[PDB]
Write a protein that binds this ligand. Structure first.
Ligand code: MN
Ligand code: ZN
Length: 444
């Protein structure tokens, strides 16, 4: 079917008015659009892309760390086994570190070399290439001008904004509410994935070359998960590059398009995607969490799925839910009922545990909280832990307060004789927040 190769939802901006036009915001967050390509974005806003050129970055922080992926240069949209025999899903992506200065040297000399090949005139085997990925631009003192340029974007797409759920977590989540940079040569691949906890993502191509994108809607993610399982791959943790013929045969639609310098790509909640550089270019990217029922629902789903798969959630959805009820007026009836439901579940499970502890003679110690103190995760199994913290007698004594979840502490110390129970929030306080959380009226 032509329905298996659908057109890409696109918007062409000419000027600042197109960029601040409110229906643009509604178009991007609409669940029917798995991806939106906003063409001409940097031009419309007069964004100085030159601030993210390799030359500028070398000048600013030449010793900054780069994660290198070493890959094979593959033809077009395919991925072949090393021998050139069959197309397969597993893709080779070996890891190391370098600096901005050293990758730049390779980026530049790579281009000079293809110029000379182009003037030499005249199934693999395939060449090897290096991709500079996940460069951390969180530091405002190292990247002042770079980060300031991005405040020129319309609010809904900014790293920081009042309507962005990630802004209400109350703490930095590296790569999500901070900017990441990518430095590329042709063939550089970002393999198939969903965003962390299914949050939306924003990507701007700095240029000068293009990137080619492949996109699959959220509700087909299960099919791709089955493919991975059948091919001995972990959907969440392995590197894989889908066989397009396998997908067409399984009746999975695939969006495909080119991102040019200055184009902004909006990846909607839960959308599955993978990317390769066609030319020489840099990209920047981060996440955004719109206040919609669909975004919250999908984030919670992946949060629960991550527990089953023994994978840590970078977004602490329990802490976030309480922050919302504490500080945000919610006027969408569906979204409100979702949050209220989750808080109720958290509260009941917490009340159930606290009473079992008390019935069994275990002391609960008032420990409280400092402000801007992150959510805590279990030092053993890395699940989020809320309110009741399990700390060893020794770690308590030394005031290191190393956190365990209840189950991990029990597996170590059968009657918890090796632990103290620390409580961060009074129950009366939590009941109050829940009870005062009501649906706000909006006429929109
Ligand atoms: Mn992504
Ligand atoms: Zn644990």
């Amino acid at each position: 079917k032509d329905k298996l190769n659908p057109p890409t939802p696109s918007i062409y901006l000419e000027n600042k008015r197109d960029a601040f036009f409110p229906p643009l915001h509604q178009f991007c967050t609409n669940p029917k659009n798995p991806v939106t390509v906003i063409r001409g974005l940097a031009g419309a806003l007069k964004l100085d892309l030159g601030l993210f050129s390799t030359k500028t970055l070398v000048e600013a922080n030449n010793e900054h760390m780069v994660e290198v992926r070493t890959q094979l240069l593959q033809p077009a949209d395919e991925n072949w086994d090393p021998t050139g025999t069959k197309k397969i899903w597993r893709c080779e992506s070996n890891r190391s570190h370098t600096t901005i200065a050293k990758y730049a040297q390779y980026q530049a000399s790579s281009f000079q070399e293809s110029l000379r090949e182009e003037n030499e005139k005249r199934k693999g085997p395939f060449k090897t290439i290096k991709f500079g990925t996940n460069i951390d631009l969180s530091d405002n003192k190292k990247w002042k001008l770079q980060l300031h340029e991005l405040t020129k974007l319309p609010a809904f797409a900014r790293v920081v904004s009042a309507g962005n759920l990630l802004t209400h977590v109350g703490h930095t989540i590296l790569g999500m509410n901070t900017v990441q940079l990518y430095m590329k040569v042709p063939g550089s691949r970002t393999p198939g994935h969903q965003e962390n906890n299914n949050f939306c993502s924003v990507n701007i191509n700095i240029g000068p070359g293009d990137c080619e994108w492949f996109v699959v809607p959220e509700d087909y993610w299960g099919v791709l998960n089955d493919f991975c399982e059948k091919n001995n791959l972990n959907f969440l943790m392995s590197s894989w590059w889908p066989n397009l013929e396998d997908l067409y045969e399984a009746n999975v639609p695939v969006y495909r398009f080119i991102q040019r310098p200055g184009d902004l790509v909006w990846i909607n909640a839960g959308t599955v995607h993978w990317v390769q550089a066609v030319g020489w270019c840099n990209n920047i990217a981060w996440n955004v969490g719109p206040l919609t029922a669909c975004q919250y629902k999908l984030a919670v789903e992946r949060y629960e799925w991550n527990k089953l798969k023994s994978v840590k959630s970078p977004v602490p959805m329990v802490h976030l839910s309480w922050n919302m009820a504490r500080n945000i007026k919610v006027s969408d009836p569906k979204l409100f009922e979702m949050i209220k439901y989750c808080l109720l579940k958290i509260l009941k499970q917490y009340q159930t545990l606290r009473e079992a502890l008390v019935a069994a003679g275990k002391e609960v110690i008032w420990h409280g909280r400092t402000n801007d103190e992150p959510a805590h995760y279990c030092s053993i199994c890395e699940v989020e832990v809320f309110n009741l913290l399990f700390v060893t007698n020794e770690s308590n004594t030394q005031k290191t307060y190393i956190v365990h979840c209840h189950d991990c502490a029990r597996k170590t110390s059968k009657s918890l004789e090796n632990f103290v129970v620390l409580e961060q929030y009074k129950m009366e306080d939590l009941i109050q927040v829940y009870d005062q959380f009501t649906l706000a009226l909006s006429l929109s």
